[PDB]
Design a protein around this nucleic acid. Structure first.
Ligand SMILES: Cc1cn([C@H]2CC[C@@H](COP(=O)(O)OP(=O)(O)OP(=O)(O)O)O2)c(=O)[nH]c1=O
Ligand code: SF4
Ligand SMILES: [Mg+2]
Ligand SMILES: [Mg+2]
Ligand SMILES: [Zn+2]
Length: 1004
DNA sequence: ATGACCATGATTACGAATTGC
DNA sequence: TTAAGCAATTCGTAATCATGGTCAT
């Protein structure tokens, strides 16, 4: 519509006289045509965009998936005619798939056995899918030519064809490529299959693949398209694609690095009133809307389709709805004009990521950056709803329209549909703001450029594929082949680290903190630890290597060789990763905005996970190339290093050498040692910690380096891997209040515990007044016992698991929700609940907070007092006031049994005899709120009731007026379903409580 | 009369969750 | 066909084991 299509390249164009330099985004292998280049037909399409905005479909042609096998050590194997007869037999076996066989000189990645290279047969195939068969035969024994490979030789260099091409040519994902002058060609308009402005093809040996450093580090003007849908379903049921139509589709298409999107459209099902600042396309039937949205996607040519819960709800619902409406022309909204976009259900499983079930869609040529998955992977939040996330990062608890009323807003006037459209537009613009604040695209681009994987791998693949790609690249650059070691079944665990005993107590003395700079990567790159340096006793005896100069032995007992024999490739990969992390931390150093500070911290934190993921992959039994020797060696080195630094810092800083006190290693967490020098001064403690870290780094190998990071003036060591204190990096002002492992920074504890622990630690460490902290704890206990705590602060969230042997509360809750509502949280979702009161097991006492808010069922206050708040508060206040004095304040001296508006099986048809006040005398036959015995207090109880009513009515007015201000509307009703707003769960509670207190005041 | 048997705390074990490096 | 590692704490539920209250004897 004169504003959607990209800029058309100059019409004075030709396959010559122009160099199409473009930054690829997507890579996909597919057959090209009946023609064959380099004796093969399959190609790798590189969907990208140039520096101006012209979408390119560079076809890389003429690459055959080669397979490395050990050349047979037979006399008749170096013969040319024998190789010819063997390749003829191979062709006759699978009907002419193999192309040729190149005898190369290459060495294995496994172990060092001299600088000699073995003869390796590099077998080509016309189409790559043959290798998976061919390789398999070489490991089963289904090939017998002169009984060469009948026993089964271990194959080598097993990877997919796309990554194979990218590794051979050097095309790291999201990098810059360039087609030289005229060497490429352009596909005829009667054979172009994509909707791109270009459709070219070039043999792989001609193009130049630029690195992502220097002149070729910039990005391309990507057309990011954020979108959302809104569907009006039947009453009391979840939206299903068979009966509940899509009523609105909002699209907020923008550009990478742009401060504002260039279009805001709302494809509506009926006539929609105009919305200032956005376009509106109002249709008549749903088929027309779907077809026009498809044509709109095709027209705009978006490089990325970002959104929230798009891969799981939006796009699958749209596809299934188009299928149900017999719109057979909808699912072709990819960069290819003939292939379908279909839903394939995959399952991801990882220890650090949890089991998830994703419904992926094959949207070709366009990246996908579903913000839900990106935030589940990068950040650890209590809830992962759009409202909770928008309140966490952006910080706005805006209104979320009720779901049941949607069916009555679409069936109304045009202004009802207009406000529906503005809701949809806000929902569709939220993911753009999220991606711009979190810097998702920049971080993931840096990641895909350092590791060298396709962008799409960062969301559907773990940390193994990155180290795999890095290893393959470094191997290709060093003439080495990676064997296809069959992954072992499993293992229980190997020996990790040796966490030092945590001397508990309260430490007002400044505790310095000295930790290692990337301990495990430093250990790896410091001792020449890799796959290619792993010798054994037989090897060193056969080669006659000198000890401590040519080869070394690790504390685990394994053998390696010094850098004088062979430089590993894991050291090089780790050098690359730490040089990336150095600049990622320098950028954080040169940055002021606290939100951008946290973003750069997350960026740095993801570059030290991969540097640790190298060691994790070397130790990962489940996965290719599991070399437990190297992981065990680095763990042994780390243990011995922390023990040695503990000994050294306890030895040098003592009385004899001329120091004031005796330095004591208070705590150690496998890389850090929190030495206590004794000096109550803080600046002196910082200087001594710096000097100690420097002296310790003096006693280690070059890549290793200990650094003074922080100091804890008030230090509260609760237990092992659990403590808190004040962060003092400067002797003039504390930075923050740390809480490691405590129940506050956890997620399976109600937010009330977090708030209480934060306030208590603030009063104890910052202000140093334990009396006020104890008074606040007593007030909190009284609030809990008297039902004075909001439901929103009593919500516990737990991550659901696929299978459960021992029943859990959230699992049974999800099952009951599925049986009752109609749909429940699948695996991987954080189910939230509150613990209602009852008699049966705890897993049978858990309910949806909305069900509790609706049914007014009481909350188990004693459970939250004793099981949720008692233990953490006790553990944090006992090192100050003793155990018994701390536990005494948790006795239940007061209770409030609600028994109100709970009409059910028995709580209905029951009376309230309305006993007397302030004495509860049942002899209240005489009317009035007081009995004749205690009538002298008739002037105080009325004061109490009236002031309770005053506070309640003030709070009620504030809350409801605030709700109206938030809803933007004053003359309309605010039916808001947003349960992530602190005022939610509270307005209704205050309304009920004020109703009861007013009815109690009406007795006088 | 003497243990028998049922009911009620200690103790151990392991699943489940989350966080710490 | 695909998935970094381990160390550590905390809580819930069951299984098992010591010990007492009361009864046929
Ligand atoms: C966080 C994390 C850590 N590890 C291991 C690996 C070694 C130690 C050191 O970890 P640390 O976070 O303190 O940080 P560190 O790199 O040592 O140091 P600096 O910030 O560079 O100073 O922990 C891991 O395997 N997976 C992880 O996700
Ligand atoms: S509870 Fe109030 S502030 Fe929160 S979303 Fe609803 S109307 Fe807005
Ligand atoms: Mg560290
Ligand atoms: Mg640490
Ligand atoms: Zn009375």
């Amino acid at each position: 519509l004169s504003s959607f299509e990209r800029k058309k390249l100059p019409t004075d164009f030709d396959p010559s006289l122009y160099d199409i330099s473009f930054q690829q985004i997507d890579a996909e292998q597919s057959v090209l045509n009946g023609i064959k280049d380099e004796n093969t037909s399959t190609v790798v399409r590189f969907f990208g965009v140039t520096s101006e905005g012209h979408s390119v479909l560079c076809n890389v042609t003429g690459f055959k998936n080669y397979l490395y096998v050990p050349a047979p050590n037979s006399s008749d194997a170096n013969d040319q005619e024998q190789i010819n007869k063997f390749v003829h037999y191979l062709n006759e076996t699978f009907d002419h798939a193999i192309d040729s066989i190149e005898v190369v000189s290459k060495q294995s990645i496994w172990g060092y056995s001299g600088d000699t290279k073995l003869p390796f047969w590099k077998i080509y195939v016309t189409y790559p899918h043959m290798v998976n068969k061919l390789r398999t035969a070489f490991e089963r024994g289904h090939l017998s030519f002169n009984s060469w490979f009948s026993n089964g030789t271990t194959t080598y260099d097993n990877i997919a064809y796309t990554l194979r091409l990218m590794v051979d040519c050097g095309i790291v994902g999201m990098s810059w490529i360039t087609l030289p002058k005229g060497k490429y060609s352009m596909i005829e308009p009667n054979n172009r299959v994509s909707s791109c402005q270009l459709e070219v093809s070039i043999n792989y040996r001609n193009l130049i693949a630029h690195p992502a450093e220097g002149d070729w580090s910039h990005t391309a003007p990507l057309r990011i398209m954020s979108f959302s849908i809104s569907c009006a379903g039947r009453i009391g049921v979840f939206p299903e694609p068979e009966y509940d139509p899509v009523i609105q589709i909002a699209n907020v298409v923008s550009i990478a690095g742009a401060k504002k999107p260039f279009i805001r459209n709302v494809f509506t099902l009926n006539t929609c009133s105009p919305i200032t600042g956005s376009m509106i396309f109002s249709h008549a039937t749903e088929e027309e809307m779907l077809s026009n949205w498809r044509n709109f996607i095709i027209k705009v040519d978006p490089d990325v389709i970002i959104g929230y819960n798009t891969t799981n709800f939006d796009i699958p619902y749209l596809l299934n709805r188009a299928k149900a409406l017999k719109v057979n022309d909808f699912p072709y909204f990819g960069r290819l004009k003939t292939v379908k976009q279909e839903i394939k259900e995959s399952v991801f499983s990882s220890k650090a990521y949890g089991t998830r079930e994703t419904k992926n869609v094959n949207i070709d040529g366009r990246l996908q950056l579903d913000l839900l998955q990106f935030i589940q992977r990068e950040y650890k939040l209590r809830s992962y709803t759009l409202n909770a996330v928008s309140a966490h990062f952006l910080g706005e608890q805006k209104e979320d329209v009720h779901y049941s009323i949607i069916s009555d807003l679409q069936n109304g006037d045009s202004e009802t549909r207009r406000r529906l459209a503005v809701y949809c537009l806000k929902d569709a613009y939220l993911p753009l703001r999220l991606m711009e604040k979190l810097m998702a695209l920049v971080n993931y681009t840096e990641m895909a450029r350092v590791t060298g994987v396709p962008f799409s791998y960062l969301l559907a693949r773990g940390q193994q594929i990155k180290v795999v790609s890095q290893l393959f690249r470094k191997c290709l650059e060093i003439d080495t082949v990676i064997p296809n070691m069959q992954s072992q079944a499993s293992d229980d665990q190997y020996e990790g680290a040796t966490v030092i005993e945590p001397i508990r107590g309260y430490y007002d003395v400044p505790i310095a903190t000295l930790d290692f700079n990337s301990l495990y990567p430093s250990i790896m790159m410091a001792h020449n630890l890799c796959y290619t340096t792993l010798c054994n006793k037989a090897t060193v005896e056969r080669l006659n290597l000198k000890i401590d100069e040519d080869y070394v032995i690790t504390p685990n007992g394994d053998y390696f060789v010094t850098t004088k024999r062979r430089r590993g490739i894991l050291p090089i990969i780790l050098d690359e990763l730490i040089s990336a992390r150095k600049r990622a931390k320098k950028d954080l150093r040169d940055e002021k905005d606290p939100f951008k500070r946290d973003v750069l911290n997350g960026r740095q934190l993801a570059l030290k996970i991969s540097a640790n993921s190298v060691y994790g992959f070397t130790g990962a039994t489940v996965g290719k190339l599991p070399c437990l020797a190297i992981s065990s060696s680095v763990t042994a080195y780390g243990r011995t290093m922390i023990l040695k630094t503990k000994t050294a810092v306890q030895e040098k800083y003592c009385i004899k050498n001329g120091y004031k006190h005796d330095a004591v290693v208070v705590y150690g967490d496998t890389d850090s040692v929190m030495v206590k020098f004794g000096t109550t001064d803080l600046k002196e403690a910082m200087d001594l910690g710096t000097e100690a870290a420097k002296y310790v780094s003096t006693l280690f190998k070059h890549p290793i380096n200990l650094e003074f990071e922080k100091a804890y003036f008030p230090y509260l060591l609760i237990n092992k891997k659990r403590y808190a204190g004040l962060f003092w990096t400067n002797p003039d002002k504390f930075d923050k209040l740390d809480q490691k492992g405590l129940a506050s920074v956890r997620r399976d504890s109600c937010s009330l515990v977090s708030i209480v622990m934060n306030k208590v630690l603030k009063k104890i460490l910052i202000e140093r007044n334990v009396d006020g902290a104890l008074a606040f704890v007593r007030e909190t206990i009284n609030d809990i016992l008297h039902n004075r705590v909001d439901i929103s602060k009593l919500i516990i969230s737990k991550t659901l698991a696929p299978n459960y042997t021992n029943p859990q509360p959230h699992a049974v809750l999800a099952e009951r929700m599925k049986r009752r509502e109609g749909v429940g949280p699948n695996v991987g979702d954080r189910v939230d609940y509150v613990i209602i009161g009852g008699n049966d097991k705890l897993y049978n006492r858990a309910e949806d907070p909305l069900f509790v808010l609706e049914n007014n069922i009481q909350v188990d206050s004693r459970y939250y007092l004793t099981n949720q708040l008692q233990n953490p508060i006790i553990s944090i206040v006992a090192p100050i006031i003793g155990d018994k004095q701390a536990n005494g304040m948790f006795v239940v001296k007061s209770i409030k049994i609600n028994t109100g508006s709970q009409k059910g099986g028995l709580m209905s048809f029951i009376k309230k005899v309305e006993a007397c006040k302030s004495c509860k005398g049942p002899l209240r036959k005489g009317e009035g709120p007081l009995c004749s015995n205690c009538l002298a207090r008739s002037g105080e109880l009325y004061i109490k009731a009236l002031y309770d009513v005053r506070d309640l009515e003030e709070k009620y007015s504030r809350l409801w007026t605030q709700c109206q201000r938030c809803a933007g509307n004053l003359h309309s009703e605010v039916l808001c379903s947003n349960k992530n707003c602190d005022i939610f769960y509270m307005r209704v509670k205050v309304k009920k409580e004020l109703q009861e207190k007013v009815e109690q005041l009406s007795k006088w």
